Amino acid sequence: LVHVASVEKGRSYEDFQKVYNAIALKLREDDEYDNYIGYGPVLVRLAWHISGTWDKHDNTGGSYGGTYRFKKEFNDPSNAGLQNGFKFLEPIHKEFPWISSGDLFSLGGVTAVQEMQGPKIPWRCGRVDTPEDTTPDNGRLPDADKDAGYVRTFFQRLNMNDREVVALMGAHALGKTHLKNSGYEGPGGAANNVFTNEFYLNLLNEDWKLEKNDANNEQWDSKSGYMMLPTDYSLIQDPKYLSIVKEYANDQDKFFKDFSKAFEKLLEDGITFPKDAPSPFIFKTLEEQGL
Ligand code: HEM
């Protein structure tokens, strides 16, 4: 399967910076969502789940085709709760009907991270919508109730290595688990709509307790009111993972730099970019624009 990036006709940096600003302006406006967390965390989760279907072996799945717009992927049990990120973006797609679905879902994730004061993420245009029959089947996204060997093995399919996996998981400092979506409940920290390295700090400094929640699932709970998933706590159980966790709890700039590279790579897996294709765009935030 080859998927070649095709820039939307005649579009350039300024067009996509207009779509960025539209998403970012609505993130500021619709602030009440999920008890004032706002839409940013569900939008970086949506960009991860449309990319996380990729399989390196046959180049199926991935962010290129925008296939989450089809019922099979929209109704995947693993995507429960992401309909709220879709409905947030649907106004903006009506306003810029020329951007492809893959591009709009991935730029929403980029915009949310930078607007929640994360690192800049280089983003590239050119994903092309593909037919309903290209939609990957349910079951390619990871279970939460498993251990470190499962996480390592699952992420080899998206060929991410240990460092990349640990840098990507730092995004679980954002938002929260919702019992009616996943059977898990609670936030992982106090700053859950500002991008920081707090996931790593909480993992190493809190007093975790294995408890059973109302959906009868086990999760790691702390006195402070935070929770960690079994696959999250996995990172301090494995010796290779645990020493990268310590590296990111001791250096927030290295965390930001490595997250930026692994999230771009995540979003680009499966796509062939021609050598005459434009460079990756670095978008300015509303704040850097005085907007
Ligand atoms: C083995 C890996 C992973 C598993 C099992 C997993 C699982 C989960 C689960 C069960 C939730 C709760 C969903 C809900 O109830 O609403 C969640 C939320 C979230 N995850 Fe993951 N995740 C994984 C990796 C990642 C990665 C790599 C990213 C992003 C780079 C990510 C970003 C998020 C975000 C931002 C949320 C919060 C959503 C919200 O607030 O609504 N996840 N994760």
Short mmCIF file of C-alpha atoms and ligand atoms in Angstrom, two decimals:
data_model
loop_
_atom_site.label_atom_id
_atom_site.label_comp_id
_atom_site.label_asym_id
_atom_site.label_seq_id
_atom_site.Cartn_x
_atom_site.Cartn_y
_atom_site.Cartn_z
CA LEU A 1 0.00 0.00 0.00
CA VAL A 2 1.51 3.36 -1.02
CA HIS A 3 0.00 6.60 0.18
CA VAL A 4 1.34 9.72 -1.40
CA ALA A 5 0.77 13.09 0.18
CA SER A 6 -1.06 15.50 -2.21
CA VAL A 7 -1.27 19.21 -1.12
CA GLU A 8 -4.85 20.54 -1.29
CA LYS A 9 -5.05 22.59 -4.53
CA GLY A 10 -3.25 25.86 -4.43
CA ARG A 11 -3.14 25.94 -0.62
CA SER A 12 -0.01 27.12 1.28
CA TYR A 13 1.08 28.02 4.89
CA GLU A 14 -1.32 30.94 5.32
CA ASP A 15 -4.40 28.81 4.58
CA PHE A 16 -3.57 26.21 7.21
CA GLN A 17 -2.61 28.90 9.75
CA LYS A 18 -6.18 30.20 9.21
CA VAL A 19 -7.58 26.71 10.02
CA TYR A 20 -5.22 26.50 13.09
CA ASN A 21 -6.47 29.90 14.36
CA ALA A 22 -10.08 28.82 13.88
CA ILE A 23 -9.61 25.65 16.02
CA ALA A 24 -7.60 27.64 18.62
CA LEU A 25 -10.22 30.38 18.84
CA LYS A 26 -12.96 27.83 19.38
CA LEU A 27 -10.81 26.03 22.08
CA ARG A 28 -10.78 29.34 23.98
CA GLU A 29 -14.50 29.94 23.41
CA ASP A 30 -15.91 26.50 24.30
CA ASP A 31 -14.14 26.29 27.69
CA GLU A 32 -16.89 24.76 29.80
CA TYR A 33 -16.66 21.29 28.27
CA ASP A 34 -15.95 18.37 30.69
CA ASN A 35 -16.15 20.50 33.83
CA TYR A 36 -13.99 23.23 32.49
CA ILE A 37 -11.15 21.05 31.18
CA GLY A 38 -12.13 22.20 27.69
CA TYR A 39 -11.70 20.35 24.35
CA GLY A 40 -7.90 20.19 24.06
CA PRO A 41 -7.25 16.72 25.68
CA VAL A 42 -10.04 14.90 23.66
CA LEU A 43 -8.61 16.50 20.49
CA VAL A 44 -5.08 15.16 21.10
CA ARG A 45 -6.71 11.75 21.89
CA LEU A 46 -8.64 11.90 18.56
CA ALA A 47 -5.41 12.63 16.61
CA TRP A 48 -3.69 9.67 18.36
CA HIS A 49 -6.58 7.17 17.69
CA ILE A 50 -6.90 8.03 13.93
CA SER A 51 -3.09 7.46 13.64
CA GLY A 52 -2.86 4.52 16.05
CA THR A 53 -4.60 2.15 13.60
CA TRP A 54 -1.51 2.02 11.41
CA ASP A 55 0.21 -1.25 10.74
CA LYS A 56 3.85 -1.03 9.53
CA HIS A 57 3.65 -4.46 7.88
CA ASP A 58 1.08 -3.66 5.16
CA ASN A 59 0.74 0.15 5.56
CA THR A 60 -3.00 -0.08 6.30
CA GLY A 61 -4.70 2.24 8.84
CA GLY A 62 -2.96 5.47 9.88
CA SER A 63 -3.96 9.11 9.60
CA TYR A 64 -3.81 9.46 5.76
CA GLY A 65 -7.31 8.34 4.75
CA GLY A 66 -9.48 10.17 7.31
CA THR A 67 -11.52 6.99 7.71
CA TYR A 68 -12.80 7.82 11.20
CA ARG A 69 -15.62 9.67 9.34
CA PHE A 70 -17.00 6.14 8.48
CA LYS A 71 -19.38 4.24 10.84
CA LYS A 72 -17.05 1.20 11.41
CA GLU A 73 -14.23 3.33 12.83
CA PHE A 74 -16.56 5.95 14.42
CA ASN A 75 -18.33 3.18 16.29
CA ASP A 76 -15.21 1.31 17.43
CA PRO A 77 -15.72 0.74 21.27
CA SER A 78 -12.12 1.96 21.71
CA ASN A 79 -13.12 5.39 20.32
CA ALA A 80 -16.01 5.94 22.76
CA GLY A 81 -16.15 9.58 23.80
CA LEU A 82 -14.25 10.84 20.69
CA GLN A 83 -17.58 11.85 19.03
CA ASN A 84 -17.20 15.01 21.16
CA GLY A 85 -13.92 15.92 19.44
CA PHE A 86 -15.55 15.22 15.99
CA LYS A 87 -18.56 17.46 16.71
CA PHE A 88 -16.14 20.22 17.89
CA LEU A 89 -14.28 20.07 14.57
CA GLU A 90 -17.39 19.79 12.35
CA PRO A 91 -18.10 23.61 12.38
CA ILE A 92 -14.50 24.29 11.30
CA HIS A 93 -14.74 21.77 8.40
CA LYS A 94 -17.90 23.50 7.24
CA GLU A 95 -15.93 26.78 7.26
CA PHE A 96 -12.87 25.34 5.41
CA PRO A 97 -14.43 22.61 3.22
CA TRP A 98 -11.23 22.32 1.16
CA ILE A 99 -9.10 20.63 3.94
CA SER A 100 -9.13 16.81 3.95
CA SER A 101 -10.43 14.85 6.99
CA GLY A 102 -7.02 13.28 7.89
CA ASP A 103 -5.45 16.71 7.82
CA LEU A 104 -8.16 18.37 9.92
CA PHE A 105 -8.12 15.54 12.61
CA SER A 106 -4.29 15.65 12.80
CA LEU A 107 -4.01 19.50 12.89
CA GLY A 108 -6.65 19.57 15.73
CA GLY A 109 -4.22 17.47 17.84
CA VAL A 110 -1.29 19.78 16.91
CA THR A 111 -3.32 22.89 17.73
CA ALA A 112 -4.51 21.57 21.12
CA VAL A 113 -0.96 20.71 22.31
CA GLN A 114 0.54 24.10 21.33
CA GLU A 115 -2.44 26.05 22.68
CA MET A 116 -2.17 24.12 26.03
CA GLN A 117 1.49 25.35 26.02
CA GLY A 118 3.13 22.26 24.85
CA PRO A 119 6.10 22.18 22.50
CA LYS A 120 5.70 23.30 18.81
CA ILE A 121 4.78 20.25 16.61
CA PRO A 122 6.00 20.48 12.88
CA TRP A 123 2.99 19.46 10.75
CA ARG A 124 2.81 18.49 7.11
CA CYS A 125 -0.19 18.73 4.73
CA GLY A 126 -1.48 16.39 2.09
CA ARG A 127 -3.52 13.56 3.52
CA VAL A 128 -6.22 12.50 1.07
CA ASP A 129 -9.65 11.06 1.91
CA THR A 130 -10.00 7.43 0.92
CA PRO A 131 -13.19 5.24 0.42
CA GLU A 132 -15.25 3.52 3.18
CA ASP A 133 -13.71 0.16 2.16
CA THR A 134 -10.24 1.39 3.22
CA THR A 135 -11.52 1.80 6.84
CA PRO A 136 -9.43 -0.45 9.19
CA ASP A 137 -11.32 -2.99 11.30
CA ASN A 138 -11.97 -2.51 15.03
CA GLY A 139 -9.39 -3.88 17.48
CA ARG A 140 -6.13 -2.11 16.48
CA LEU A 141 -6.02 0.21 19.43
CA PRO A 142 -4.46 -0.87 22.81
CA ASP A 143 -6.10 -2.32 25.91
CA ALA A 144 -5.54 -0.50 29.26
CA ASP A 145 -5.55 -3.45 31.59
CA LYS A 146 -2.24 -4.92 30.50
CA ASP A 147 1.46 -4.80 31.41
CA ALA A 148 4.80 -3.41 30.12
CA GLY A 149 5.53 -6.32 27.74
CA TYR A 150 2.11 -5.75 26.12
CA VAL A 151 2.77 -1.99 25.67
CA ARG A 152 6.25 -2.67 24.17
CA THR A 153 4.90 -5.29 21.81
CA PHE A 154 1.81 -3.31 20.75
CA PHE A 155 3.91 -0.22 19.88
CA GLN A 156 6.37 -2.18 17.74
CA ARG A 157 3.45 -2.45 15.23
CA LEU A 158 3.58 1.43 14.87
CA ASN A 159 7.35 1.20 15.14
CA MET A 160 7.88 3.19 18.11
CA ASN A 161 10.80 2.25 20.38
CA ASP A 162 10.96 2.51 24.22
CA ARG A 163 11.93 6.12 24.28
CA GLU A 164 9.21 7.11 21.82
CA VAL A 165 6.57 5.12 23.75
CA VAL A 166 7.49 6.76 27.12
CA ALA A 167 7.56 10.26 25.55
CA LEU A 168 4.12 9.65 23.92
CA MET A 169 2.53 8.39 27.23
CA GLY A 170 3.32 11.77 28.95
CA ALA A 171 0.14 13.01 27.14
CA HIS A 172 -1.86 11.06 29.77
CA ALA A 173 -1.18 14.03 32.15
CA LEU A 174 -3.96 15.68 30.07
CA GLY A 175 -7.72 15.32 30.61
CA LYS A 176 -9.08 12.30 32.45
CA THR A 177 -10.60 8.86 32.17
CA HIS A 178 -14.38 8.76 32.09
CA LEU A 179 -16.05 5.60 33.46
CA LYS A 180 -18.87 5.55 30.90
CA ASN A 181 -16.36 5.69 27.98
CA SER A 182 -13.66 3.30 29.15
CA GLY A 183 -14.54 1.67 32.52
CA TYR A 184 -11.83 3.77 34.22
CA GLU A 185 -12.34 6.96 36.25
CA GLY A 186 -10.33 10.00 37.34
CA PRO A 187 -7.56 12.49 36.36
CA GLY A 188 -3.81 11.81 36.58
CA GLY A 189 -2.76 15.13 38.02
CA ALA A 190 -3.66 18.66 38.99
CA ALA A 191 -2.71 20.48 35.72
CA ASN A 192 -4.83 18.49 33.31
CA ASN A 193 -5.30 21.05 30.53
CA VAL A 194 -1.81 22.56 30.57
CA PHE A 195 0.92 20.44 28.82
CA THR A 196 3.70 19.63 31.44
CA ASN A 197 5.92 16.62 32.49
CA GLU A 198 3.66 16.00 35.59
CA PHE A 199 2.69 12.46 34.46
CA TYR A 200 6.28 11.39 35.16
CA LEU A 201 6.52 13.33 38.42
CA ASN A 202 3.25 11.82 39.77
CA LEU A 203 4.18 8.30 38.74
CA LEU A 204 7.44 8.54 40.73
CA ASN A 205 6.22 10.68 43.70
CA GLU A 206 2.71 9.57 44.57
CA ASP A 207 1.67 6.79 46.84
CA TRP A 208 -0.23 4.46 44.51
CA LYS A 209 -2.87 1.98 45.67
CA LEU A 210 -4.35 -0.79 43.45
CA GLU A 211 -8.16 -0.46 43.81
CA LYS A 212 -11.31 -1.59 41.99
CA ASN A 213 -13.54 1.07 40.43
CA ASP A 214 -17.38 1.05 39.90
CA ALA A 215 -17.04 -0.60 36.48
CA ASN A 216 -15.17 -3.40 38.35
CA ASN A 217 -11.86 -2.65 36.78
CA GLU A 218 -8.59 -2.30 38.62
CA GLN A 219 -6.70 0.97 38.57
CA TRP A 220 -3.92 2.63 40.56
CA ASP A 221 -5.26 5.30 42.94
CA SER A 222 -3.52 7.94 45.07
CA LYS A 223 -4.40 9.89 48.24
CA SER A 224 -4.34 13.10 46.20
CA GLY A 225 -7.32 12.00 44.06
CA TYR A 226 -5.27 10.95 40.99
CA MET A 227 -5.42 7.68 39.14
CA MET A 228 -3.17 5.73 36.77
CA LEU A 229 -4.20 2.98 34.33
CA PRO A 230 -2.49 -0.52 34.60
CA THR A 231 -0.60 0.22 31.35
CA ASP A 232 0.45 3.63 32.78
CA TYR A 233 1.84 2.19 36.02
CA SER A 234 3.67 -0.36 33.82
CA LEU A 235 6.24 2.29 33.01
CA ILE A 236 7.71 2.25 36.51
CA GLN A 237 7.52 -1.60 36.67
CA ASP A 238 9.86 -2.17 33.73
CA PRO A 239 13.61 -1.20 34.21
CA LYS A 240 14.18 0.22 30.64
CA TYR A 241 10.97 2.31 30.81
CA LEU A 242 11.57 3.38 34.42
CA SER A 243 14.94 4.99 33.65
CA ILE A 244 13.44 7.08 30.77
CA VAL A 245 10.53 8.16 33.16
CA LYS A 246 13.18 9.45 35.56
CA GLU A 247 14.91 11.30 32.72
CA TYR A 248 11.68 13.12 31.81
CA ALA A 249 10.72 13.88 35.45
CA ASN A 250 14.18 15.47 35.77
CA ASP A 251 14.21 17.46 32.48
CA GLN A 252 11.01 19.04 31.07
CA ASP A 253 12.77 20.47 27.94
CA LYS A 254 14.06 16.97 26.86
CA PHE A 255 10.48 15.64 27.42
CA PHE A 256 9.03 18.46 25.20
CA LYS A 257 11.67 17.87 22.48
CA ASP A 258 11.14 14.09 22.39
CA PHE A 259 7.33 14.33 22.54
CA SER A 260 7.36 16.71 19.53
CA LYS A 261 9.37 14.26 17.41
CA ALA A 262 7.33 11.17 18.36
CA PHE A 263 3.90 12.87 17.95
CA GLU A 264 4.88 14.18 14.43
CA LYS A 265 6.18 10.69 13.56
CA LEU A 266 2.91 9.21 14.89
CA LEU A 267 0.87 11.55 12.72
CA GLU A 268 3.00 10.90 9.61
CA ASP A 269 3.31 7.08 9.69
CA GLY A 270 2.26 5.55 6.35
CA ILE A 271 2.54 8.73 4.27
CA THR A 272 4.99 9.18 1.42
CA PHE A 273 5.91 12.81 0.92
CA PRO A 274 7.35 13.63 -2.65
CA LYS A 275 10.64 15.70 -2.60
CA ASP A 276 8.91 18.71 -4.14
CA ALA A 277 6.36 18.67 -1.30
CA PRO A 278 6.55 21.75 1.05
CA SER A 279 8.50 21.68 4.28
CA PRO A 280 6.71 21.00 7.59
CA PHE A 281 4.82 24.03 8.84
CA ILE A 282 5.49 25.44 12.34
CA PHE A 283 2.27 27.34 13.32
CA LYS A 284 2.23 30.33 15.56
CA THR A 285 0.01 30.27 18.61
CA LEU A 286 -2.79 32.88 19.20
CA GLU A 287 -0.56 34.26 21.94
CA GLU A 288 2.45 34.72 19.63
CA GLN A 289 0.05 36.43 17.21
CA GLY A 290 -1.48 38.72 19.87
CA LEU A 291 -4.88 37.25 18.98
C1 HEM B 1 -1.09 1.68 25.67
C2 HEM B 1 -1.44 3.06 25.37
C3 HEM B 1 -2.63 3.74 25.67
C4 HEM B 1 -3.84 3.27 26.24
C5 HEM B 1 -4.30 1.89 26.69
C6 HEM B 1 -4.59 4.41 26.43
C7 HEM B 1 -5.82 4.42 27.07
C8 HEM B 1 -6.61 5.50 27.47
C9 HEM B 1 -7.83 5.39 28.10
C10 HEM B 1 -8.51 4.12 28.54
C11 HEM B 1 -8.30 6.69 28.23
C12 HEM B 1 -9.62 7.14 28.84
C13 HEM B 1 -10.70 7.43 27.80
C14 HEM B 1 -11.96 7.95 28.44
O1 HEM B 1 -12.52 7.34 29.33
O2 HEM B 1 -12.44 9.01 28.08
C15 HEM B 1 -7.32 7.48 27.67
C16 HEM B 1 -7.39 8.89 27.50
C17 HEM B 1 -6.49 9.78 26.90
N1 HEM B 1 -5.41 9.37 26.25
FE1 HEM B 1 -4.70 7.43 26.11
N2 HEM B 1 -3.97 5.50 25.97
C18 HEM B 1 -2.78 5.11 25.50
C19 HEM B 1 -1.88 5.98 24.88
C20 HEM B 1 -2.05 7.34 24.57
C21 HEM B 1 -1.16 8.10 23.82
C22 HEM B 1 0.08 7.52 23.12
C23 HEM B 1 -1.78 9.38 23.73
C24 HEM B 1 -1.42 10.56 23.05
C25 HEM B 1 -0.14 10.89 22.42
C26 HEM B 1 -2.92 9.32 24.52
C27 HEM B 1 -3.72 10.40 24.88
C28 HEM B 1 -4.84 10.46 25.72
C29 HEM B 1 -5.47 11.62 26.16
C30 HEM B 1 -5.05 13.07 25.90
C31 HEM B 1 -6.54 11.18 26.92
C32 HEM B 1 -7.55 12.05 27.64
C33 HEM B 1 -8.89 12.14 26.92
C34 HEM B 1 -9.95 12.99 27.60
O3 HEM B 1 -9.67 13.76 28.51
O4 HEM B 1 -11.11 12.91 27.23
N3 HEM B 1 -3.13 8.06 24.93
N4 HEM B 1 -6.26 6.75 27.29
#
